[PDB]
């Protein structure tokens with residue numbers, strides 16, 4: 001019913017697809033950042049995941065903060081020692097956008113081990129707002145996932161958790177995931193979770209909604225499957241830790257399937 | 263920054279700053295200037311302003327107030343908005359003897375629903391619809407304004423801030439403290455506004471949350487399971503509430519034709535799931551003959 005906004009879900013979906021093009025970071029910006037690497041970004045995002053946990057923030061808030069960072073770094077070159085300042089400010093902005101009860105600024109200063117002053121965080125906040133021109137209502141992987149979940153029958157707790165987990169793993173690694181749109185990564189995450197748990201594939205109802213087939217999702221699937229299989233070995237583990245817990249049904253303890261049979 | 267604007271007069275104030283009517287000395291454009299103080303040593307940019315700007319920047323529709331510019335300093339933020347002559351509350355008050363012509367009521371409702379359909383279509387909840395927040399000009403237009411309490415939602419919705427919507431205009435699902443609310447809470451407000459335009463009087467002027475429910479009940483009948491599945495399973499619901507019958511809208515809103523009455527009730531349905539969308543409301547027979555009159559200002 002009204003919580004799923006029947007009279008609007010199509011209009012909404014259509015516009016998020018248009019807006020996710022607009023909020024898309026530059027795919028190749030890392031090569032153009034002289035003092036920042038994919039590795040460093042990974043470490044930053046991984047830390048934001050932890051911050052997300054310590055303060056019990058929405059996952060949506062984490063996805064937003066990464067969008068904010070990626071766009072900021074598409075336009076501004078930043079020295080490594082100020083990378084964390086960008087990230088702290090983005091988490092702050094995302095919190096203020098998305099959360100009922102955002103942490104106070106002081107708390108965001110606290111988490112950087114006083115690497116930075118409050119004055120620096122507030123000022124970086126302003127700079128980030130200017131650079132993004134206040135376009136903060138970015139479509140996330142999560143905004144698409146929750147939409148795709150409605151096509152399940154019945155809704156499966158494990159599928160939902162597992163698709164979230166996969167979705168978050170993508171946040172970490174700019175290569176390859178910056179070349180995929182949110183809606184694409186989400187579809188891959190949901191196919192891959194639904195296949196792993198139940199054995200089923202991307203429904204046709206969603207083929208109709210999205211225009212995406214397994215054919216079109218194949219590249220993104222190949223990458224994501226690979227990221228899934230290698231996840232225990234990845235240098236960043238906060239997301240695996242996170243999705244061991246009871247809350248997410250211990251999906252990160254599930255063995256990934258060895259083939260996708262496509 | 264602001265050297266091109268001349269302040270003409272104060273037009274109201276808020277929590278983070280005052281609103282002044284101003285004029286571009288170079289273009290002549292009359293504008294509304296919202297000054298929002300930045301807490302540059304404490305809390306930074308207010309989240310209410312981050313939401314208002316980001317959402318207004320996306321919403322471009324004839325019935326939504328236009329944000330024209332955002333002027334930055336290190337210390338202030340100035341939001342430049344189109345100027346509209348006055349708000350609906352003032353209009354109603356000015357019209358409290360002479361009455362408001364029905365064509366303009368119908369015109370204004372139609373536009374409000376167009377504005378609102380566009381918000382919902384764009385995953386934005388307004389959450390503060392009331393006369394004071396609706397702006398009109400001299401040409402017979404009305405526009406949703408004050409998106410400070412607005413929120414971009416996902417599908418399905420999740421738990422959002424509960425302390426939302428001015429009491430009088432607050433949907434029963436919020437009052438009964440439901441986990442989830444959605445687009446229907448905006449429709450409720452317009453429903454109350456619809457009634458109010460017709461009678462020039464607040465439909466449910468409660469002096470408290472318990473008093474707000476009591477006012478709704480007697481007017482619409484105390485909801486049971488048969489009218490609203492879940493009302494009794496809802497928190498804040500009390501099996502103790504009196505059992506009032508529904509009053510005939512012919513007494514609640516006498517001036518109103520059978521179509522108006524019918525649209526009004528669908529807008530005021532208890533069950534959020536049964537309550538009419540803005541999009542469906544646009545199709546309602548009430549609007550078959552809608553025109554665009556100018557108001558007597």
Ligand SMILES: NS(=O)(=O)c1ccc(Br)cc1
Pocket residue numbers: 129130132133134315319329330331332333
């Ligand atoms: N990039 S900005 O100066 O924050 C800006 C925001 C909104 C408008 Br509408 C115009 C300009």
Ligand SMILES: NS(=O)(=O)c1ccc(Br)cc1
Pocket residue numbers: 281294296327343344345346347397407408409
């Ligand atoms: N800041 S606002 O509430 O959208 C607003 C816009 C225009 C006038 Br005129 C008055 C108020």
